[PDB]
């Protein structure tokens, strides 16, 4: 597409985290990786290097107090990123406190939550 963050998505092995902010996909500062605002929703792309190729897992993480615009946008952005990656990503819904062990294991220090978040776009 033309979204600058799509253009960066899945180019190298690693971990990319975006936060939904007012109907947009905004990179999370790397210093804050692993700490999630309970008031927000996030999209996470884990890229792994195989026999040449790259494998993709997309997780959308929903804080217990995130607003419906944020959780809805997280879901849609996940679909759109997958489409941009030619459908090759596996999508995972991650709910605060019930995350998959695969998602937790992306973070050496473990998943942590914080109070607050960005205001809804409604």
């Amino acid at each position: 597409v033309e979204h600058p963050e799509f253009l960066k998505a899945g180019k190298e092995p690693g971990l990319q985290i975006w936060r939904v902010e007012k109907f947009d996909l905004v990179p999370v500062p790397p210093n804050l990786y692993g700490d999630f605002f309970t008031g927000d929703a996030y999209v996470i792309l884990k890229t792994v290097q195989l026999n040449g190729n790259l494998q993709y897992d997309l997780h959308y993480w929903l804080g217990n107090e995130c607003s419906q615009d944020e959780s809805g946008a997280a879901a849609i952005f996940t679909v759109q990123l997958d489409d941009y990656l030619n459908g090759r990503a596996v999508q995972h819904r991650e709910v605060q406190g019930f995350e998959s062990s695969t998602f937790s294991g992306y973070f050496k220090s473990g998943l942590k939550y914080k109070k607050g978040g960005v205001a809804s776009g409604f």
Binding site: L62, S71, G72, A75, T78, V79, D82, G87, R93
Partner: peptide, 29 residues
Amino acid sequence: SLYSSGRTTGIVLDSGDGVSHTVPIYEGY
């Protein structure tokens, strides 16, 4: 409706005034 519920996979039971549908959806479609 599925998107509004924060999901990309699920089955929606939509029942209005004139019709009801069950719509399985996987990874957005």
